[model samples]
Target: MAHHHHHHVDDDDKMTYVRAIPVSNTKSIAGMREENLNYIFNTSLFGVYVPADLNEDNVKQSMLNVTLVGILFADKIEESQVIIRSASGEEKTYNVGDKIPGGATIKRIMPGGVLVERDGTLESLSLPKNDLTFEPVAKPLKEE
Candidate 1:
């Protein structure tokens, strides 16, 4: 024999009954797992916030094909020269007032880098260095 119970509550002039039947696991229309069903319904009135979509056509790209390989400094500041590899793989030396490819004019030669002006914009190029050097030492292992 099976037994069933019924419970009810009265608010104002209406009555609300508490269901006593077993709830069977029913899959949702989206085919989500029925056992993962959530009974708590929520609503949010907050303003929407999202990231702006990026357009590939509006993005600007700059390519620097010249590399600063070497530099020569004279006692006269205006006589200093810098060696740069052009985009055509040819190495050439330029004084402080010479122009490389793309009309990039050599502006000044610092101690370790060179400065150039391209399209009214002053850009800097540094000599590539072997910075990936290390001095190894012994270390203790983990205690675990």
Candidate 2:
């Protein structure tokens, strides 16, 4: 004769369980690999075009196109600013730590010009010198 043992459970007891399934295939949606998916998404839909590589030489050449036109000197360094002109004649005022065109940032604003930081190096650009002289004219004779 065999005897069966019965287990008793409380009526108010509640339990929950979860399981994680391992993925067999590493492919992305629609069976496309990650690189292929990135290439497809990065391509322009309108036309065929390739961008120039961002090499060191290219960056240096780009930085050469930037010029310092003016500097607004102030008693406080934080309040000082500089005016920079790009190759396209576009001018903009930037304070210290502000990013300027041609992949450079304004490091400091001085009385003569500004210091620009590019590619972990600092470059100085002096303001253009002016030769125009001003002369005062005699006062006009008063009417009798």
lDDT of every predicted structure (CA atoms): 0.57, 0.60
Q: What C-alpha lDDT, on a 0 to 100 scale, does residue 101 get in candidate 2?
A: 68
59-113: candidate 2 lDDT, tens digit per residue: 3244555777677777777778887778876787778778876777777766555
Best by lDDT: 2
Per-residue accuracy of model 1 over 7-119 as CA lDDT, tens digit each: 46555533436574444655345456333333211121233322236334423332365667678877766777888877665688788877778667777765466677866
Error of 1 at 35 (Å): 58
Kindly give the stretch of ten consecutive residues in candidate 2 with the minimal lDDT sum.
130-139
